[PDB]
RNA sequence: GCCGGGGUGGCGGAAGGUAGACGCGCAUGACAUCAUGUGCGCAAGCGUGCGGGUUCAAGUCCCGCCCCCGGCACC
């Protein structure tokens, strides 16, 4: 008997697949329904492996189900070439971004295809062409002309690794998005917005019907961030000006015994008294300089200034102080807020430092608060010291004063987001060059349509285009001198570019129609597809692409190119891959494991001696090395930087694919973060060799055999199979769906074993061969070349052809069920009787069981429970 | 602190009514591989975060806490 051999055979059908282009993805589905599956695509910039192909992996076998179910299928693929990702690794070898990305690419291909990937690669997507960007910008255009593109002055955020500015949401733990270590500075410039904070309510409503992991959407809801409050307006002493500030106590006003305007407040300098004007002008470039790690290196401590200044409380109509504390932010709401110290706990900690006065104006119920107050009262009660309003609740108190302003004009009601306008200005070569030019007659004045695209400019100095503090692009004039197209005066471009997640909120339409050279996608395309109802990727995108992309989807459907509104139905989050880690030597001592320094660092503790226990209980083993020592070893993530990824493209050629899939696929849930093993990746030869072995066993007893037979005629073990099989089918099938394909495969290993127990009293029976015509397309989707290998030692077509095997309901119909009988609670034993097999007589060969257990404690019995299904209970 | 999601064999995990599917590791029997056994306890008996409890039957239901992971935290 041979064996299997994947280099035999998984190279051969992938050439095939392809030729006899299966995933090609139709044009304008019609009839049978239609499957959008979709892997995030990758930003090129390093090789693949394992930990990468995960997801991909998803995808496909997901792909080739619906497929198999005859749905009509679109599996894309593509890559994300510009902007910062590329470019910075470019840079940290030197290489020139378009040698590089189109490089990358290829290895990437490659890789995906060798693990039995399809796609449709006539749908290639390769964001940093011409042919793209070009949209990108017509995008830009059509957002400009809505109002919703914008410049800006204000204060941006710096990444000197990246020598640029980021968005707000480029900002996680408050340090570079790709760059875990080095923390973002404050910078004053006029930049490049998207107006997304117009969206702020449909982004936040929308989210309530869509079926996304809780975890992203609550993400999502508390990061646009609603709140319903009122803006108040405070006069300023003398001045004509008047200072307005967001509250969610409306009902505190005459508790106003300040305010506190955000450093960057333009009113912050252009009040401060000419005395306190020195002071206040330290504490701007105090706060601008230190950042948002220090920030919390500091704690909640208050500080601030006195800018020597008044206001008017619009209520009582009296003057009080304005400071300049820190504590205000002023990237929200108005960036100034009227302080109440005696029911927050923020303002009284102000106010209990700064001497600043402290009113009480909300008595709490039955018990009265003290007199000193010692601490906020921040929980509602009855109004107290507002004049008219002394007596009214709490909760009545806000829309009754805010009412009582909308009159004097004073103030008004309104919902404020914290949600902030989206920076799309880079300063880096790569990137899509923003079609708008600088005028000096006419303002700054847009490009027209048909004049698109404004394509980059080429440059071979790799030493150059190095992003230097100032845009790349304004070194070379050439670029920028040009003309306006309203008159035809001087005219410089704007020499700044498009953030690569601008590309990444909205590929996934121009997947639909990704020839177009007219839209950027025929709408009847579009929608002939969308929405995707697989998006398959990861949690790191929850409040970016994931944000970004449905306010483009929701702009794009209000030029009414897109019918949908929410561009993925069906987010479904992923697991990073871990490896076992070499962290380094280690010197054991009886049992005491000693941490050289190295070692200890790497492992980020401060420990230097651990016990072999200590080592268990943080999930660590220490094994031999080459190098004569013990060394410690530890599950980390699977990266390049950590140097533990299992390659794609070795790792095929000396053992294979499928082997692959299986074992990225069978460890955890998907959901669940896994850990790629030697333990693990030996499974897969296994269990591959079992479905091997058991069809090669029976090649010619097969051949000579018909797969037909009349259903309910089989009878005994023919009869046991064939439900065991249907049954399986309906766990194969429904763990599919659910993409629960862990156990979905569990359960095709679960009938191996079966079908192996079968054979052993049971020869090739037509139900045996039908058992494996139904087996092979159950594989397909995971071990898909090994799966066609075996079907087509039979059959003559394709397994992508032979339709997801049809269940039969009536097969799962249980006859002679395993019945356990109890007495108390305890399971005393098993016995064997048919489903509706009546009380009296599970009675009968329970009383008899394996060690007659049941009569061991059943020597008086009052009543009895028996359960058709699989139960029977005596008491006492 | 708030939100989000988890505490079940030696491991990843499976699931009101036989807890531990399937695999990994371990252990013996075959000519690496297949077969066979494997919650724990020598046993009495015990076991799904910890305590009460409701139920003939609780991983599953109720009341009261605990703890780990992820994110947001002067908004
Ligand atoms: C969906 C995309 C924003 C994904 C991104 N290109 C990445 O590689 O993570
Ligand atoms: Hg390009
Ligand atoms: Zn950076
Ligand atoms: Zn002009």
């Given at each position: 008997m041979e064996k299997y051999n994947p280099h035999a055979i998984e190279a051969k059908w992938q050439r095939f697949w392809e030729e006899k282009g299966?995933?090609?993805?139709?044009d304008l589905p019609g009839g049978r329904g239609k499957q959008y599956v979709l892997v995030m695509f990758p930003y090129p910039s390093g090789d693949l492996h394992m930990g990468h192909l995960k997801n991909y992996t998803m995808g496909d076998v997901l792909a080739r189900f619906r497929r198999m179910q005859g749905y009509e299928v679109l599996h894309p693929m593509g890559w994300?070439?510009?902007?910062?990702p590329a470019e910075n690794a470019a840079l940290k070898f030197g290489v020139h971004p378009k040698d590089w990305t189109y490089a990358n690419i290829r290895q990437a291909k490659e890789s995906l295809r060798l693990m039995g990937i399809l796609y449709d690669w006539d749908r290639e997507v390769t964001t940093c062409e011409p042919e793209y960007y070009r949209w990108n910008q017509w995008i830009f255009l059509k957002m400009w002309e809505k109002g919703l593109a914008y410049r800006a002055k204000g204060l941006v955020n710096w990444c000197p690794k990246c020598q640029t500015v980021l968005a707000n949401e480029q900002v996680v733990e408050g340090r570079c998005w790709r760059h875990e270590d080095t923390p973002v500075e404050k910078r004053e410039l006029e930049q490049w917005y998207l107006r997304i904070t117009a969206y702020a309510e449909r982004l936040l409503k929308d989210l309530e019907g869509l079926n996304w992991p809780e975890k992203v959407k609550a993400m999502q809801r508390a990061w646009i961030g609603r709140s319903e409050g009122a803006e108040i307006l405070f006069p300023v002493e003398g001045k004509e000006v008047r200072i307005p500030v967001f509250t969610t106590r409306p009902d505190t006003l005459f508790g106003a015994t300040f305010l506190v305007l955000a450093p960057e407040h333009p009113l912050t300098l252009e009040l401060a008294a000419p005395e306190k004007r020195e002071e206040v002008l330290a504490y701007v470039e105090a706060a601008k300089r230190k950042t948002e790690i220090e920030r919390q290196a500091e704690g909640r401590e208050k500080t601030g200034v006195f800018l020597g200044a008044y206001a008017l409380n619009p209520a009582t109509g009296e003057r009080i102080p304005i400071w300049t504390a820190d504590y205000v932010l002023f990237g929200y709401g108005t960036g100034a807020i009227m302080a109440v110290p005696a029911h927050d706990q923020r303002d009284y900690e102000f106010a209990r430092k700064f001497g600043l006065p402290i009113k009480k104006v909300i008595e709490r119920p039955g018990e009265p608060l003290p007199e000193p107050l010692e601490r906020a009262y921040e929980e509602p009660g009855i109004m107290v010291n507002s004049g008219p309003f002394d007596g009214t609740e709490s909760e009545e108190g806000k829309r009754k004063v805010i009412a009582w302003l909308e009159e004097k004009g004073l103030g008004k009601g309104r919902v404020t987001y914290r949600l902030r306008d989206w920076l799309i200005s880079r300063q880096r070569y790569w990137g899509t060059p923003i079609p708008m030019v600088h005028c000096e007659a006419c303002g700054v004045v847009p490009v027209p349509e048909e004049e698109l695209p404004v394509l980059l400019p080429d440059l071979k100095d790799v030493e150059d285009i190095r992003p230097k503090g100032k845009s790349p692009l304004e070194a070379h004039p050439e670029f920028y001198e040009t003309t306006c197209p309203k008159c035809g005066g001087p005219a410089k471009r704007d020499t700044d570019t498009m953030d690569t997640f601008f590309d990444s909120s909205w590929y996934y339409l121009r997947?639909?129609?990704?020839?177009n050279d007219r839209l950027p996608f025929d709408p009847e395309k579009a929608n002939a597809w969308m929405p995707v109802d697989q998006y398959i990727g990861?949690?790191?995108?929850?409040?970016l692409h994931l944000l970004y992309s449905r306010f483009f989807t929701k702009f794009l459907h209000d030029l009414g190119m897109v019918k949908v509104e929410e561009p993925f139905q069906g987010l479904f989050t992923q697991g990073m891959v871990l490896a076992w880690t070499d962290f380094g030597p280690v010197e054991v001592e009886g049992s005491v494991v000693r941490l050289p320094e190295p070692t200890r660092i790497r492992l980020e503790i401060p420990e230097s001696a651990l016990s072999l226990e200590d080592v268990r209980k943080m999930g660590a083993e220490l094994r031999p090395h080459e190098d004569g020592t013990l060394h410690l070893w530890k599950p980390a993530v699977m990266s390049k930087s950590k140097g533990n990824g299992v390659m794609v493209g070795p790792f095929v050629k000396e053992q294979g694919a499928d082997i692959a899939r299986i074992t990225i696929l069978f460890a955890a849930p998907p959901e669940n973060e896994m850990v790629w093993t030697e333990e693990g990746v030996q499974g897969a030869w296994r269990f591959l060799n079992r479905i091997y072995r058991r069809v090669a066993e029976d090649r010619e007893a097969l051949l000579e055999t018909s797969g037909v037979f009349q259903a309910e005629a089989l009878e005994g073990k023919d009869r046991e199979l064939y439900g065991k099989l249907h049954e399986t089918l309906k766990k194969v099938t429904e763990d599919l769906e659910a993409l629960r394909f862990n156990t979905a495969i569990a359960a095709l290993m679960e009938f191996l074993n079966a079908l192996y127990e079968y054979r052993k009293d049971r020869p090739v029976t037509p139900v045996y061969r039908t058992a494996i015509r139904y087996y092979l397309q159950m594989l397909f989707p995971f071990a898909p070349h090994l799966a066609e290998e075996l079907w087509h030692w039979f059959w003559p077509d394709s397994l992508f052809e032979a339709g997801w095997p049809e269940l039969d309901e009536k097969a799962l119909e249980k006859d002679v069920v395993e019945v356990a009988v109890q007495v108390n609670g305890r399971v005393r034993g098993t016995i064997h009787i048919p489903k509706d097999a009546p009380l009296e007589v599970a009675r009968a060969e329970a009383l008899k069981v394996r060690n007659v257990r049941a009569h061991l404690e059943g020597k008086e019995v009052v009543k009895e429970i028996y359960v058709p299904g699989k139960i029977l209970n005596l008491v006492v």
């Open positions: 299966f995933m090609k993805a139709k994300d070439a510009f902007g910062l997947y639909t129609d990704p020839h990861g949690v790191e995108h929850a409040v």
